[PDB]
Amino acid sequence: AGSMALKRIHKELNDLARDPPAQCSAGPVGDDMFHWQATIMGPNDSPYQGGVFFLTIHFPTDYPFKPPKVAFTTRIYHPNINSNGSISLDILRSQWSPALTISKVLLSICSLLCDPNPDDPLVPEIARIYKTDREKYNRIAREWTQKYAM
Amino acid sequence: AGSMALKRIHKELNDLARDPPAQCSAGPVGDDMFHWQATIMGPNDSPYQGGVFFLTIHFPTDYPFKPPKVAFTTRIYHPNINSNGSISLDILRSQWSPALTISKVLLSICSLLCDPNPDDPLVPEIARIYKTDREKYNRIAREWTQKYAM
Amino acid sequence: MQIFVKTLTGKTITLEVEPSDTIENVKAKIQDKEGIPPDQQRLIFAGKQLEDGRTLSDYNIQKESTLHLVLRLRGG
Amino acid sequence: MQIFVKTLTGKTITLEVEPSDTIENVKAKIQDKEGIPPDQQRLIFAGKQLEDGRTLSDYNIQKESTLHLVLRLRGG
Structure with missing residues (x-):
């Protein structure tokens, strides 16, 4: 019913625990299997290197047929992530399929x-800097990673 | 095996005893040849002048192919030494070679x-003072040497 | 029991530990085989940064569990 | 109580709400059944763009009232 969602989330949790990705980690916040926290590790060779970015994840009651709600709770300087931690990724909206998993989302x-x-x-203003002065972009992104992500 | 490490540490100990550096001294804490204590003497013409700084040294079981673990146990005001007595020196990490010795490390x-x-x-906050107000830096370093190092 | 520790160097090390080991104990062991100062180490399991005084068993870390090891940025 | 929410996809969804619900509460609920981020949502009733901190009852939104939902333009 929603017992169906729970069954699927338990399954994804078991899969994650068996072999988790190196660059990210996730699991229930507390005792509510619908509410998870995640860490995304700043990639090597990026201005985010060294950062640990925390995310909130809420699974809907008819998962896996709607996508999870996922937002950054750590501030991050990025053209595709806004000040609400909202994330621009098609798989979180029109392109979600019950085939996908939480690990695929974090990857x-x-x-x-x-x-x-x-x-x-x-965030157009950040994209503008990214596109015209990549070096300033890397500066600012690095600075935010140091302020907020460690 | 680790008998190999022991053989090397005995050797370094014998070398030290034969002709020790003037500004530092080291040897086994007790009856465990892997666990040493060291003194570093505050240099002349430094704000550390007059201080005796104690360090802990633990040799790994596959010495000399990994570096020794070395930390200050005396508090010291320095941009490259933190509140855990942890020491920023490349030879203690990526730059260690089995060619090096404990005397080289203390020097x-x-x-x-x-x-x-x-x-x-x-420690960025100390470096900032070092770089912008060397006189205040020398004041604080001198004060810590008097509080902690004698 | 054995646990895995994955890095951002993608690399995987194994550790022999007890359920009663504290997280500082685990960091001590990582310093032993990798030479990484505990103070540089961030340990992460199931989306949580692990607290130094807690035990493996407080986080339900069991045999064959995998932790993530992330290094803080530190100057020389 | 039940309210309707009309879109520019002409489409109509229903929501169960209380008079004391805030407009951010209503946006939360729309995110729940439609997956639209609250920050993309503009809610309009009786010619007014609704303010996030106000309640339904501050605008005299009652049972069977109809609101308009307009999505902001947002890039990927």
Whole structure:
């Protein structure tokens, strides 16, 4: 019913625990299997290197047929992530499929950290800097990672 | 095996006893050849002048192929030494070679006391003072040497 | 019991530990085989940064569990 | 009580709400059944864009009232 969602989330949790990705980690916040916390590790060779970014994840009651709600709780300087921690990733909206898993979602966000999408930006002002002065962008992103992510 | 490490440590101990450096001294804490204590003497012409700084040294079981673990047990005001007595010296990490010895390590730390590295600092807040107000730095370092090092 | 520790160097080390080991104990062991100062170490399991005084068993870390090891940025 | 929410996809959803619900509460509920981030949502009733901290009852939104939901333009 929603017992169905729970069954699926337990399954994803078991899969994660068996072999978790190196660049991210996730599990229930407390005793509510619908409410998870995640860490995304700043990628190597990025201005986010060394950062640990915390995310909130809420699974809907008819998972896996709607996507999870996922937002950054750590501040991050990125053209595809806004001040609400809201994340611009198609798989979190129109492109979700019950085939996908939470690990796939976090790996997509790791990948987004490595490779921003400045031509279809959530935050135009950051994309502008990314596109015209990548060095300043790396400066500011590094500074935020030091302020907020360690 | 680790009999191999012991053989090497005995050797370093014998070398030290034969002709020890003037500015430092080291040997086994008790009956465990892997656990040593050291004194580093505050250098002349430094704000550490007059201080005796105690260190702990633990040799790993596959010495000399991993570096020794070395930390200050006396509090010291320095941009490259933190509140855990942890010491920022490359030879204690990526730059260790089985060629090096404990005497070389302690001499490097003496030298670090004479010549801090404020542009690549362990403790940024101290480096800032070092770089902008060397006189205040010398004041505070002198004060800590008097509180903690005699 | 054995546990794995994954890094951002992708690399995986194994540790022999007890359920009653504290997180500082685990960091001590990582310093032993990797030479990484405990104070540089951030340990993460199931989306949580692990607290130094807690035991493995407080986090339900069991045999064959995997932790993530993340190094803080530190100057020389 | 039940309220309707009309979109520019012409489409109509229903919500169970209380008069004391705030507009951010209503946006939370819309995120729940439609997956639309609250920050993308503009809610409009009787010619006014609704303010996040106000309650339904501050705007005289009653049972069977209808609100308009308009999505902001947002990039990826």
